[model samples]
Structures are given as C-alpha cells and as structure tokens.
Target: GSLDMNAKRQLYSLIGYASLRLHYVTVKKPTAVDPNSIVECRVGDGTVLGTGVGRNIKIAGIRAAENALRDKKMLDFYAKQRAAIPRSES
Candidate 1:
C-alpha cells in the first residue's frame, strides 16, 4: 500500500530532534557556522546549498526520497532472495 500523507512525518522512527540538535551543537563550529549553515548541509548522499524555507524543504524532500529509494532497494533485494528459493511439492 502507498504511504498515508497525514502520517508521513511519523512513518519512520524519529532519530529525534534532540540528537540532530546536539549533532549541530557538537560538530558544527559555533562562530564559523553561519545562520545559513543548513544551506550547505548534506542530505543523504547529496547536498542542498541554500538558506531558507525553500532550501530546507528541498533538503527534507531529498531525505524522504532517499528513504523511499532505500526501502525500494531493500524490498527488491529481499524479493530476489525469496524467489531464489527452490519450489517444493506440498
């Protein structure tokens, strides 16, 4: 079945905003990091370079897409494994 839009935000286990917040706090240089740091932040296997709602949303969308793509890949891998099993008489 297709995903429900209303529950999209809750579909995956949340890594927790606190962990993300803490990652920035610890990894990012306080002063060197500008308010627009997220503009150049990495989203999955790519980067989103810009600052603002549009940019952030673009990054978020990429993340969601990446998750969906990975899920599809995993499903395909599992299907192959299952199909590889030899048929047996009942």
Candidate 2:
C-alpha cells in the first residue's frame, strides 16, 4: 500500500524540523566571529537538497531549504524515509 495522508503530513513535518536544524547549524558560528559573517550551508547527501552562502546565515539557510523543497525529488526522498517507519495507532 502507498503512504497515507498521515504519513505525508509527517514527512513534511520532519522536513520542516530538519530545515530548522540546518538553519541553526548555519547560524551558530563559533569563536569571536561576527553574527553577520558569511556562512556556507548545505543539507542532504549525494543529492544535495540545499546549498547557500550568505552573510545572514539564518535567513540564507532558510531560503536554501525553501528552494530545495521546491524540487520534487527532494520531497520524495523525505516521503520515502517517512514511509519506512512503522506507524502505531496505540
């Protein structure tokens, strides 16, 4: 059977959370670096979902994920992962 609506929505929720994590990693610059310092960011593997480099790391990371999500393949990747999990109706 195919993934249900519940699974699809769960996939999107995971993607959203992952995007937030990418944003955090991009913005969390170490040392005495300036907050506005240019930072490079990326998510996903061989099929890179997003890639971004900008001064405002926070916004830049968010934009990168937004662009990645527009790609159908990227959405499918997350959906597949979500489908792999067993659901519990307890």
Q: What would the TM-scores of all predictions be?
A: 0.21, 0.44
TM-score, structure 1 vs. true: 0.21
Candidate 2: minimum summed lDDT over ten consecutive residues — where? 1-10
Which residue runs of candidate 2 sit more than 4 Å off their true CA positions? 1-14, 17-24, 27-48, 86-90
lDDT of 1 by residue, 11-40 (tens): 122221211221111122113344221212
Using TM-score as the measure, the top candidate is 2
Q: Tell me the spans in candidate 1 whose CA falls farther than 4 Å from its real position.
A: 1-55, 73-90
Q: All models: lDDT?
A: 0.28, 0.42
lDDT of 2 by residue, 1-90 (tens): 111223223323545433233332354443355544222334433244554333455444444455555556756765664454355232
Model 1 local distance difference test score = 0.28
Q: Every model's Cα RMSD, please?
A: 12.1, 10.1
